[PDB]
Amino acid sequence: NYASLKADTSMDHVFGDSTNKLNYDFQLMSSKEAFFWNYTLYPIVGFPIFLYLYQFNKLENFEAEIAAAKAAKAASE
Amino acid sequence: AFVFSTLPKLSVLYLISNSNIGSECVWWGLISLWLGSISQYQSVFVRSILLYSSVAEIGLVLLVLQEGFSWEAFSWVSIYFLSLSGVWHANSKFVSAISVASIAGLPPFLGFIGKAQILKSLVSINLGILIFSSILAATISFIGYLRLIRLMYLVSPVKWKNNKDSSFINWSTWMLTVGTLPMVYSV
Amino acid sequence: ASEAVLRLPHKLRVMRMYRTGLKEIVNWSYGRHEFYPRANALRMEFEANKELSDREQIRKLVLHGEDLLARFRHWEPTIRSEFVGGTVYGVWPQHCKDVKFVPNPAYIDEFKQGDTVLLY
Amino acid sequence: VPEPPYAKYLANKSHYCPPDFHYSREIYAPYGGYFNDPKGWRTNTAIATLVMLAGAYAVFCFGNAREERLRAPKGWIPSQLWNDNVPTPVDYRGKVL
Amino acid sequence: SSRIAGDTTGKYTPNIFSPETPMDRSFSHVPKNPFWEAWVFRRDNIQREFVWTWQTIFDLATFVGGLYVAMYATASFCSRQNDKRNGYPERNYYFSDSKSNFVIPDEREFY
Amino acid sequence: TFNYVIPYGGSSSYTINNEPVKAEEVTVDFSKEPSASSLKLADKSDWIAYTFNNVPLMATVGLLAGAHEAFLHYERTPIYGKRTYNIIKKLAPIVINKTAYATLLGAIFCATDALYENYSGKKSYTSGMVAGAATGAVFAIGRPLPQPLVWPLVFAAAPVIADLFGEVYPESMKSARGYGTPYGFENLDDAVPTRNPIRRNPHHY
Amino acid sequence: VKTLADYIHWRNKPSSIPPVDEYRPPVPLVNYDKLSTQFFSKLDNDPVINRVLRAPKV
Amino acid sequence: MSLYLFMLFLQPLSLSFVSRSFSKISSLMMSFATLWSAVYMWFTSNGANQTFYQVVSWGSDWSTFGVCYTSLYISLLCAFIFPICVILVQGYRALSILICIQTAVSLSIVSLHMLAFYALFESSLLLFFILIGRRKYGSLSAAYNISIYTFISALGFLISAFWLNWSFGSVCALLPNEEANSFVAFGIFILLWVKAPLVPFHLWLPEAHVYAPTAGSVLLAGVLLKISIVGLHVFFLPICASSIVKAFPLILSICLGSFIFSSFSTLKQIDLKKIVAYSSISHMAIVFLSSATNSGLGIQGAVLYCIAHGLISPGLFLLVGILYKNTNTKLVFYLRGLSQQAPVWWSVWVFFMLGNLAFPLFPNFIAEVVCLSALFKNHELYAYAFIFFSFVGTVYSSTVLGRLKGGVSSQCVDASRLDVISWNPLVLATVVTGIGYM
Amino acid sequence: AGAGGPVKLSPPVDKPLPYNYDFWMDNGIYPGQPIYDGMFGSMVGNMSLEYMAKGWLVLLPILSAPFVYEHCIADDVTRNPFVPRQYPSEVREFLALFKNGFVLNDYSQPDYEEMKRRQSGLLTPIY
Amino acid sequence: DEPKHQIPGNALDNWAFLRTYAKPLPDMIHYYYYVYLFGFFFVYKVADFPEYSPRVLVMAALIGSLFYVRRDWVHREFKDSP
Ligand SMILES: CCCCCCCCCCCCCCCCCC(=O)OC[C@H](COP(=O)([O-])OCC(O)COP(=O)([O-])OC[C@@H](COC(=O)CCCCCCCCCCCCCCCCC)OC(=O)CCCCCCCCCCCCCCCCC)OC(=O)CCCCCCCCCCCCCCCCC
C-alpha cells in the first residue's frame, strides 16, 4: 500500500550518514523587511515609468512657463 | 399544499389589477424577497425550502403588479403552477429536477420565461434598489435550489414510493421543456 | 563549530580539527608540492599544545582553532568526482531492477477506457 | 528474477554499453535506446544521406529562385556558375568586368 | 505472481479470479507517503489557519492594494499623456471630475 | 462593426446637435412629485433639525428589535411557575438599550452627514462614506481585531449603495421611454403616439 | 446589546494548529559553519595562520 | 451555417435513438461530422461579406444566428477539440452530459441575440454542477463555486439585456444601438469579468478544473473561457464602447493585477492541473485588455491568442490526465524521472510547455506579439508592464519541469497508442498555426 | 565510469512536513538542495551577505575612481590633446546627426552648442 | 486512514454546548399571533410615516439587521433568572 518509511543504509558508509539535518525553520521573510524590499525593487522594475513621468513634467512645466512669458509679452504689447 | 399555494393567487392578482389596489410602498415586496431567500437558504427541511421560494417570488410579483403589469403576473402564475407541479408530486427524480430548474428560472425551460417577464417589468419601472436586491436574493435562492438537486443525485442513494398517478405531471414536464420557444415573444 | 562537532568528545574534537585543517590545506594549495610543508606546520601547531593540562587554556586553543577553521573554509572544496558534491555524482545513476511496466496498455479494455460520471 | 517472456523480443546490450550499466530495455524513445547500434544501421544511414541530398537539391532550387542580388559584386563570385541573375561585376574603381 | 492483462489480438479478458496479479494500469501507480498526503491536505486547507492580524492586514494592503494603487496611478498618467499627445480635450473618465463631455473622439473630426 | 480592421462602436459629432422632439403630443403623468414633508426631511441645512427629523426611523427599528428579543425571552418564562424575579425588570433593559444604541448610531450618522455636507458645501458620495465610517467606528469601539476594519467599511458602503441605486440610477434613466421611438433615435419609422401610456393611476395609499 | 457581531465566526484564532514536530531534510555535514560577518578581522593575519600557511617554504 | 446548426442539433438527438452500446462510436462520428460541417460553413463564408459572413434567422429575433471573424474562429476551435473530449469519456451518462454542454456552448457562439445567448449559455449550469460534483472523483464545493459565480454574473447580464430590450426595442446585435449608461455597461461587464477569470472573480476556475474530468477540463479551458471574447466583440464593444473608454485606467488596473497575482499564485501550486489552470488565468488578461483597446490590432490579436490558448492548454490538460491515469497522482513531488520513464510523453509535455511560455515556433508567440503591439499602440508603459512580469511564468514552468525531469523512479509510466492518437491532432494544429497559418 | 556510478538515496520522509517544504528540492538522491542555493542552509565559504557588502564597499571607490575623473571632472576641451576627426562638410553634417556619434564633441566647430544639446537628447519619445 | 480536519475543542465539552439547545420549546403560534397583529397595525401606520431619504432607510435597515437576534440564539442562552 503505502511506501515504506524505512530508509536504506547500504551506502551510508560510502557517502556519509543522514543524521545531520537542515537548520532552516522553513519560514519566510518578515513583514517589515518585505515592505522595504518590495517598495525598493518594484520601482527599479518600473524604471520607464519614472523616466516618462520626469520628461512629461519637464515638458508641461516648460510649456506653462512659455505660456506665462507669452501672456506677459502680450499684455504690455 | 400544491393547489392552495398556486390557485388562490390568481384571483387575488386579478382583483388587485382590476380594482386598482396598489400602494406606493415597496417595503413589503422587498422584505418578502430578502426574507424568503435567506430563510430558504437556512432551512434544513425540503418542504420549507419550497414554501419560502413562493414567499420570495410572490413578493417580487407583488412589486411588479402594483405598477400595473397585469399580463406578466398572469403568465407568471401559470408558469409557476406548471413548474411546481412536478416537485410537489415527486415520483421521479428527473421530473423533480426539471421542476426545480424551472422554479429557479433556468433558461432551457418555461420557468425562465416566467421569471424573465417579472424581471423585464422591473427594469421598466427603473427602481435600482429593487433590481440590486433581486439579483442578490436570486443568487441566495439559487443556492437552496442547488441543495435540492444535490439531495437527489449527489448525496446518497434515493428510493421513493412508486406512486404511478402522474395524471398531468408528464404533460407539465413536457410543457416546461417545450413551451419556451413558442412563448418567447412574451419576453 | 557546528552542533555535531560540539557534541563530540575532546579527543575526537581535536581529531576533527586536524582532519579539517589538513583538508583545508589541500583546498587552499596550488599543488601537491605546497601540501607537505604546510602539513608538517599544522603537525607542529597541534604538537605544541598537546601536553597542556590546564582545561581553560585548552578550551581557548580549541575555540580559537575552530574559529580559524570556520573562517578559512574554501569556497571550492576539492572533492573526488564520484562522491557527494562531485561532478560525476548522479550523471547516469545505475537504474535498479523490479520496474513496474504495463505491457500492451492500450489493449486492456480498449473500447471502455475513459472517465465515467457516477450518480446517486 | 526470472526474465519475463517478452524479454526474447527485446534486444541485447550493445558493445558500447558498459557492462555494469543497467537500463530497462522495454522503454521506447524516438532518439534511440541507451546505447543503440541497431542491426541494419548502415542501410538506414545510406537512406538518410539520400534523403538529405534530395532535400538539399530542392532547397537549392528554391534558394536559387529566391536569391536576389541587387548590387553588383566587386569580383567574380561562385554563384555565377549556377545562378544567372548575378549582376555583372564592377570593381572598386567602377570599371565593369 | 504477475500476468499480462492486455492482448493485442483482441482476445482480452479480465481474470478477476486469477491467482496471479494482472499487470493492469494500476501496476505503475505511485506508492505514496503518509506525511506527503497530510502535507497536501494541510496546504490545500490553508484557510483554516488564516488569522486576521495587523501583520496580515499590513501585508495584504501594502502588496495587493499598493500594486492596484500604483497601476491605477500609472494608467491615469498614461491617459493624460495620450490626451495631450492626440490633441484631444481632457476626457471625462469615471472618477476624474471634469467639466468636459469628451469621451469618444469623432472619426470625422480632425484633431 | 463585427470586423477585425476598424474599431467597434461608433462616434457622435460634438458640434452637431439634434433638436429635442417630444415623445408624445400630450403628456399625462401618473408619477407624483415629492411632498413638502420629504423636502423638509431631506433638508440638511441645520444639522440638529436634520438629525431630529430622521432619528424616529432609527428609534422605531431599535424598538422592534428590542421587542423581538424581549418577546423571545417572555415566551420562554413559565406562567405556571410563579417567578421570584420581576419579568419587566428583566425585559425593560433589553428594549431600552437596543432602542438607545440604535438611536445613537443613527444620530451619529445623520449629524456627521449634515456637518460634512455643510462644511464641504457640495452634495457628494464622500459625506455618506464619512458618516458611515464614523457610525461603524462607534459600533466597534471595544470589539476584536477584524471588526475595527469591517464595520467602518460596511457602514460606509451602505450610503454608497443608497446613493448609487436611489439617486443616480433613477436620474440616469429618466429619458428612456419604451414606447414609440427610441429616445436617441427618432429618425427611425416607429408608431408615434398621441398620448403616453398610463399603466396605473397616481397612487394614494 | 446583543448583535450579529457577537455570533459571527470571526477569524481571530487559528482553527487548525500545525504539528510541533517537523521534518528537517538531511544535509551533508559542514564541521565548522560559523558565519564570517567581518570583512577585516584579526583572524586572517593570525599567528597560527601565518605559521601554517604563509611561512613554510615552498 | 444551416448545416452546422442542424448537425449541432443532431448530435444530442442521436443519443436518444442509439443502442446505448454504440453510443461512443456514434458520438465520435457525429463529432467529426460536425467538424466537417464547420469546415463547410467556413467554405460558404465569403470574405467579400465584410460585416457578417453569414446570417440565418428561423422565424424570430431569438433564432437569429450568424458568424463573424471571432465567431467563426471560436466555432471551428470547439468543433476541432470536441472529438478528443468524446474519446476521453466513457458511459452514456457522461456522453449525454458532454454532448448537451457542447451543443449549448456551440449554439451560444453563433447566436446574435443577447437573450438567446444567455439562454443557451446558461442551459449548461446544472450539467457542470453534476459533472464537477460526480460521485467519487468530484467535489461539491467546486460545483457550488462555478454554479453560483455563473448565476450571478449571467443574471446581471440578463438585467442589462432586459433594459436594452425595453429602451431600444431590440437586443439583437445586427440592429445598431449605443448606450452611455454605466449601470447597463457594468451589467454586461460583470459576466465578462467572471467568465474570463479576472481577479478577484477567478476563484471558480481552479476548483472546477481540478475536480472536473479530463474531457470536461479540455472543454472548459478550450472554449468556455473564450465565450467571454465572443460576448465582448459581439455584445459589449458595439454598444458599450463609451464605458470601456471611460473606465480604461480601471480596466488596465484590474487586468494587470490579475496577470501579476495569478502569476504569483501559480508559484504556490503543487498540483499539475492547478498549475495549468492558473496559467490560463494569467493568459486571459492580455486578451481582455487587448480587446478593450477597441483597435484593429487588439481584436485580431485577442482572437488569435484565444486560438493559441485553445490549442495549447487543452494539450497540457490532456497530457496531465494521461499521466494521472498512469500514476494515480497529480502531485509534482511524487512524480520524478519522467524524462527517462516516459520519453514520448516528456517530449510532448516539454513541447506544449514551451508553447505556454510563448516561444517563437508556437502560435502563442505570434498572438502575443500582436497583442503587445496593440498595447504599445495605446501606451509604451502598458506593453512594458506585461512584458516584464511574463518572467514569473518562466519561473514556475521551469521549476515544474525541473522537478518532473530527473530523479529515481521504479515505474514505467508512458502513454499508450490511444493516448498518442489523442494528442496528435493538437500537435499538428499547433505546428501549423506556429508557422503562420493562424 | 560516467554511467552506472553508485548513488545514495535520500531517506523517505518520516515526520510532519513543514508548510514551505517546497523550498527544498529533492530528486531522491541524498544531497538535496534549496530551490536557490544560498537562500538558506550552509553558505559557500561561510561568508554572509554583510561580508560581501563590506567587500563591495571597499572595492567600489577604487573601481569608480578612473571613470569619475573623465566623465565628471574632465571636460571636452581637456579630455584629449586633439579635436575629433575632421571631415568634409557633407560628411561632417551627416555624421553630426547621429546622437551616438563621435563628431558631436568638436569644440572647434561653430555648431558645438547645438551638437552638445543633440547629444543630450530626449529621455522618452514625446509622442 | 486519511488526512482529516482538526476539530477544535473536546468531544464532551462540545457535546455539552450542543446539549444547551435541548430546552422546553414554545410553540411558534405565540410569536406569530403578536407579529400578525402588530404587523397589521404597523402596515396601517406606515402609510402615515413621513417620506425618508433613501440613505436613512438603508442605514435603518442595516441597523435592524445587525440588531436582529436569531430565535435559536435566545433559545440556547435563555435563563429563567433575574
Ligand atoms: C412582540 C412581538 C415580537 C415582534 C416585534 C415586532 C412585531 C412586528 C411588527 C411589524 C412587523 C413588520 C416589520 C418587521 C420586519 C419584517 C419581517 C417580518 O415581519 O417577517 C416575519 C418575521 C417572522 O417570520 P419567520 O418566517 O417565522 O422567520 C424567518 C426567519 O428565518 C427567522 O428565523 P431566524 O431568526 O432564526 O433567522 C434570521 C435570519 C432571517 O433572515 C432575515 O432576517 C432577512 C432580513 C434581511 C433584510 C430584510 C429586507 C430589508 C428591507 C427593509 C425595507 C425597508 C428599508 C428600505 C430600504 C432598505 C434597502 C435594503 O437572519 C439571520 O440569520 C440573522 C441576520 C438578520 C439580517 C441578515 C442580514 C445581515 C446583513 C448585514 C450585513 C452586515 C454583516 C457584515 C459582516 C459579515 C461578516 C462576514 O417576524 C419578525 O422577524 C419580526 C421581528 C421584528 C424585528 C425586526 C427588526 C428590524 C425591522 C426593520 C429592519 C429591516 C431589516 C430586517 C431585519 C430582520 C427582520 C426579520
Ligand SMILES: CCCCCCCCCCCCCCCCCC(=O)O[C@@H](COC(=O)CCCCCCCCCCCCCCC)COP(=O)(O)OCC[N+](C)(C)C
Ligand atoms: C395552447 C395550449 C398551451 C396552453 C396550456 C394550457 C391549455 C391546456 C391544453 C392541454 C391540456 C392537456 C391536459 C393534460 C392532462 C393529462 C390528462 C390526464 O391527466 O389524465 C388523467 C385523468 O385522471 C383522472 O382523474 C380521470 C378523471 C377525469 C378524466 C378526464 C375528464 C374529462 C372532462 C372533459 C374535459 C373536456 C373539456 C370540456 C370542454 C372544454 C389520467 O391519469 P391517471 O390515470 O390519473 O395517472 C396516470 C398514471 N401514469 C401516467 C403514470 C400511467
Ligand SMILES: CCCCCCCCCCCCCCCCCC(=O)O[C@@H](COC(=O)CCCCCCCCCCCCCCC)COP(=O)(O)OCC[N+](C)(C)C
Ligand atoms: C515526430 C516528427 C518527426 C517529423 C519531423 C518533421 C520535420 C519538419 C521539417 C521542418 C520544416 C522546416 C521548414 C520551415 C519553413 C516553413 C515552411 C512553410 O511555411 O512553407 C511556406 C513556403 O516557404 C518555404 O518553403 C520555406 C522553404 C523551407 C526550406 C528553406 C531552407 C530550410 C532551412 C530552414 C530555415 C527556416 C527558418 C524559417 C523561420 C521561420 C509556405 O509558403 P506560402 O504560400 O507563402 O504560405 C504563406 C505563409 N504563411 C505560412 C505564413 C501563411
Ligand SMILES: CCCCCCCCCCCCCCCCCCCC(=O)O[C@H](COC(=O)CCCCCCCCCCCCCC)COP(=O)(O)OCCN
Ligand atoms: C488599503 C489598501 C491601500 C493601502 C496601501 C496603499 C499604499 C500604496 C501607495 C503608493 C502606491 C505607489 C505610488 C502610486 C500612487 C502615488 C500617489 C497617487 C497620486 C499620483 O497619481 O501621482 C502620480 C504618481 O506617479 C505615478 O504615476 C505612479 C508611480 C508609481 C508606479 C511605479 C512604481 C511601482 C512600479 C511597479 C509596477 C506597477 C505599475 C505597472 C504599470 C504622479 O503625479 P502625476 O504627474 O501623474 O499627476 C497626477 C496628479 N496627482
Ligand SMILES: CCCCCCCCCCCCCCCCCCCC(=O)O[C@H](COC(=O)CCCCCCCCCCCCCC)COP(=O)(O)OCCN
Ligand atoms: C457594488 C458597489 C459597492 C462598492 C464595493 C466596493 C468594495 C466594498 C468595500 C467597502 C468600501 C466602502 C465603499 C466605497 C466604494 C466607493 C469607491 C471609492 C471611490 C471614491 O472614493 O470616490 C468617490 C466616488 O465613488 C463612489 O462612491 C461611487 C463608486 C461606486 C462604487 C464602485 C461601483 C462598482 C464596484 C463594483 C466592483 C465589483 C462588485 C463586487 C462588490 C468620491 O466621489 P465624490 O462625488 O464624493 O467626489 C468627492 C468630492 N467631495
Ligand SMILES: CCCCCCCCCCCCCCCCCCCC(=O)O[C@H](COC(=O)CCCCCCCCCCCCCC)COP(=O)(O)OCCN
Ligand atoms: C439592497 C441590498 C444591499 C446589499 C445586501 C447584501 C446582502 C448579502 C447579499 C449576498 C448575495 C450573494 C449570494 C452568494 C452567497 C455566498 C454563497 C453562500 C455561502 C455558502 O455557504 O454556500 C455554500 C457553498 O457556496 C460556495 O461554495 C460559493 C462560494 C462563494 C460564492 C462566491 C459569490 C459569487 C461571487 C460574488 C460577487 C460576484 C459579483 C457581484 C456583482 C453552500 O451552502 P449549503 O448548500 O451547504 O447550505 C448550507 C447552509 N449553511
Ligand SMILES: CCCCCCCCCCCCCCCCCCCC(=O)O[C@H](COC(=O)CCCCCCCCCCCCCC)COP(=O)(O)OCCN
Ligand atoms: C471602485 C473601482 C470601480 C470598480 C470597477 C473596476 C472596473 C470596472 C469598469 C467596467 C467598465 C464598464 C462599467 C461601467 C462603470 C462601472 C464602474 C465604473 C466606476 C464607477 O463606479 O463610476 C461610478 C459611475 O458608475 C455608476 O454610477 C454605476 C457603477 C456600477 C454599478 C454597480 C452595480 C450595477 C449593477 C447593475 C446591473 C445591471 C443594471 C442594468 C439596468 C461613479 O463615478 P462618477 O462618474 O460618479 O465620478 C464621481 C467621482 N468623484
Ligand SMILES: CCCCCCCCCCCCCCCCCCCC(=O)O[C@H](COC(=O)CCCCCCCCCCCCCC)COP(=O)(O)OCCN
Ligand atoms: C561594479 C558595479 C557595481 C557592482 C555591484 C556593487 C553592489 C554594491 C552594493 C553593496 C555596497 C553597499 C551595501 C549597503 C551597505 C550595507 C553594509 C552592511 C550590510 C548589512 O549590514 O546588511 C546587509 C544587507 O544586504 C545588503 O547590503 C544589500 C544591499 C545591496 C544593494 C543592491 C545592489 C545590488 C547588489 C548586488 C551585488 C552586491 C552583493 C553584496 C551586496 C546584509 O543583510 P542580512 O542578510 O544580514 O539581513 C539580515 C536578515 N534579516
